[PDB]
């Protein structure tokens, strides 16, 4: 009955965002100049996450060191060694006194730096951990490559629920501003909106062509954008249950590896694998100024909570605080 | 410029010192990726263990770190990207099973032509050679005519030639392949890995110095 759902979504597709957005004041060429470039990582970077204080941020690299910066002054604050050299995630607590990581070895190590060694290790997954985002400083939603996310609990250390609905590997999840729902972009070219309390999928947005390496929520919480290996970012609306705008441009063959939204949700800052991140207009489907300052691949991206800066780590072992 | 700021800068400098020490001790260890099918004696190559299942062994006072990933599902298209700075890929192959050998060839072909592993040289171990000898002394249409450049020699060099053809089909100076004929009771595998890794680092240095 998939054709029935396709027809139902077609029926409500009476208007197109590109056509509806035909008459709006365009955003001029965005000139984002590298304000800071944080160096000190032995090897390529894999993930990072801005803190709630809008300045402190964490970065995890291949070298096996989890490092906490201070983007305002660039003065490091912590360099926590890892129990495994392979990590592909980084989590920040809304309180700001907890940090998480993980990857191969299937452990979501969680550090308590409000004394910095370990506070818990979550060992329920049968595949590589991909992305973990702190929920309330006591529950940590966690993806994994065994095709199932999970909502954990620090005190018990065991899954509270399990979102076993996917078919491929889960790559990235983004919590809603309400902290009630979240999504997860899998490798089966889909992205399912889950429910934290109910613990069951509510929608599936099968509108991609290949894996989905990153995902982010709209600031209002009623839409989210996905980044694929088709070199195309798509914007999905929860209410309309269909794709709105596809940010695909010719002469771009490298697949996206990160995506994030601006404070007003106007610019989709998508970090590509073509040596240089891009900036897309959220509601115009047009390319704004490119942010090319990395000599290697871009492996992460994070826009500050207050929107004052956007950091784009890459595989050259350098974090750059653009603005 | 303040009370806490100078302490913060001191902490940053200390962290930088520890990072520099870790960099000094890190580039000296050559991480190795071990990729073999279930039937292949990839654990037997670890049966020579010398101090995911890491096995850290050093030869001539230089450390090699060996990583074999077996706890993950059989969809190694996204967790293999993590193994991009590995010095060499130790591809272990069971040379006895003719039926399963085509799968090993296809796996090696996928490893060789990969976009992200386009700069990783591969050490190829065709172990269980004793089983191969026993089988021949007691599938592929390319064996109809073939001259080695007893019959066990012809068979083993046929398998090696197939692997080498797969390697050189898209071969380039960026990365090379080093075949070997391992036995289940061979203890010299450490020396073979050492010589191969030495040549890999030598070629990396040659590329860096622009002598080529």
């Amino acid at each position: 009955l998939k054709n029935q759902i396709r027809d139902a979504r077609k029926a409500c597709a009476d208007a197109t965002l590109s056509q509806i957005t035909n008459n709006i004041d365009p955003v001029g060429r965005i000139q984002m100049r590298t304000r800071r470039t944080l160096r000190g990582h032995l090897a390529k970077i894999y993930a990072m996450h801005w803190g709630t204080d809008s300045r402190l941020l964490v970065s995890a690299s291949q070298d096996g060191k989890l490092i906490i910066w201070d983007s305002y002054t660039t003065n490091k604050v912590h360099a926590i060694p890892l129990r495994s050299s392979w990590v592909m995630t980084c989590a920040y607590a809304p309180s700001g006194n907890y940090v998480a990581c993980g990857g191969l070895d299937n452990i979501c190590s969680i550090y308590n730096l409000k004394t910095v060694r370990v506070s818990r290790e979550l060992a329920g997954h049968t595949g590589y951990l991909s992305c973990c985002r702190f929920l309330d400083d006591n529950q940590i939603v966690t993806s994994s490559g065994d095709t199932t996310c999970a909502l954990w609990d620090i005190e018990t250390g065991q899954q509270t629920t399990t979102f076993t609905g996917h078919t491929g590997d889960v790559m990235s999840l983004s919590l809603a501003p309400d902290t009630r729902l979240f999504v997860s972009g899998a490798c089966d070219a889909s992205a399912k909106l889950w429910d934290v309390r109910e613990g069951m999928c509510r929608q599936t947005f099968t509108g991609h062509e290949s894996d989905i390496n990153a995902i982010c929520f709209f600031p209002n919480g009623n839409a989210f954008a996905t980044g694929s290996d088709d070199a195309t970012c798509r914007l999905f609306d929860l209410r309309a249950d269909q794709e709105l705008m596809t940010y695909s441009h010719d002469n771009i063959i490298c697949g996206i590896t990160s995506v994030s939204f601006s404070k007003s949700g106007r610019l989709l800052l998508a970090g590509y694998d073509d040596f240089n991140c891009n900036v897309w207009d959220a509601l115009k489907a047009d390319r704004a100024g490119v942010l090319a300052g990395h000599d290697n691949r871009v492996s992460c991206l994070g826009v500050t909570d207050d929107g004052m800066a956007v950091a784009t780590g890459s595989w050259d072992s350098f974090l750059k605080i653009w603005n | 410029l303040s009370a806490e700021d100078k302490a913060a800068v001191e902490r940053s400098k200390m962290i930088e010192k520890q990072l520099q020490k870790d960099k000094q001790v890190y580039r000296a260890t050559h991480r190795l990726l071990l990729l073999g099918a279930d039937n292949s004696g990839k654990s037997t190559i670890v049966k020579q263990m010398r101090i995911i299942f890491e096995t850290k062994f050093q030869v001539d006072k230089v450390n090699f770190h060996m990583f074999d990933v077996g706890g993950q599902r059989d969809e190694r298209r996204k967790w293999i990207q993590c193994f991009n700075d590995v010095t060499a890929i130790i591809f272990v192959v069971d040379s006895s099973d003719y039926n399963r050998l085509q799968e090993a060839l296809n796996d090696f072909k996928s490893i060789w032509n990969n976009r992200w592993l386009r700069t990783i040289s591969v050490i190829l171990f065709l172990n269980k050679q004793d089983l191969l000898a026993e089988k021949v002394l007691a599938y592929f249409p390319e064996f109809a005519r073939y001259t080695t450049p007893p019959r066990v020699t012809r068979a083993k060099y046929f398998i090696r030639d197939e692997f080498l053809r797969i390697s050189t089909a898209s071969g380039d100076g960026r990365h090379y392949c080093y075949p070997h004929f391992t036995c289940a009771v061979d203890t010299e595998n450490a020396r073979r890995i050492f010589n191969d890794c030495k040549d890999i680092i030598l070629q990396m240095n040659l590329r860096e110095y622009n002598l080529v």
Partner: nanobody, 126 residues
Framework: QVQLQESGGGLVQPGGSLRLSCAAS????????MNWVRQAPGKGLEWVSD????????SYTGSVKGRFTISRDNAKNTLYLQMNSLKPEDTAVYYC?????????????????????RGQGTQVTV
């Protein structure tokens, strides 16, 4: 949404020929390398053929080399696998699979036990 279905392989006597066609939908059919794949009764998932997005780069497995033909057509999203020499042990099942990434010949899980861009598979018997 990627969805691949194949038809035209249910049963054929050992002598003769058989034509397999795998239909492609939901994605651009000029950027992805398509492979064919088999299964066996109580065995693993094999690998047979391949063809690049450009049109002319065909790889094969040793067992069926020289008696199987593969062709793909752009502007009409479908795949083909001509089989003009049938042998009893090559007649278990014939899946249809796509290489995960476009503009890239690197395929790793085209024969994984639980793949996402694989067709439902057409039963083949002899």
């Amino acid at each position: 949404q990627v969805q691949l279905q194949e038809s035209g392989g249910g049963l054929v006597q050992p002598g003769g020929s058989l034509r397999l066609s795998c239909a492609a939908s939901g994605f651009t059919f000029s950027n992805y390398k398509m492979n064919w794949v088999r299964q066996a009764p109580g065995k693993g998932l094999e690998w047979v053929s391949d063809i690049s997005q450009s049109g002319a780069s065909i790889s094969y497995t040793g067992s069926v080399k020289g008696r199987f033909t593969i062709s793909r057509d752009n502007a009409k999203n479908t795949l083909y696998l001509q089989m003009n020499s049938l042998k009893p042990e090559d007649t278990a099942v014939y899946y249809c699979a796509r290489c995960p990434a476009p503009f890239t010949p690197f395929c790793f899980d085209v024969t994984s036990t639980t793949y996402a861009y694989r067709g439902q598979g057409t039963q083949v018997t002899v």
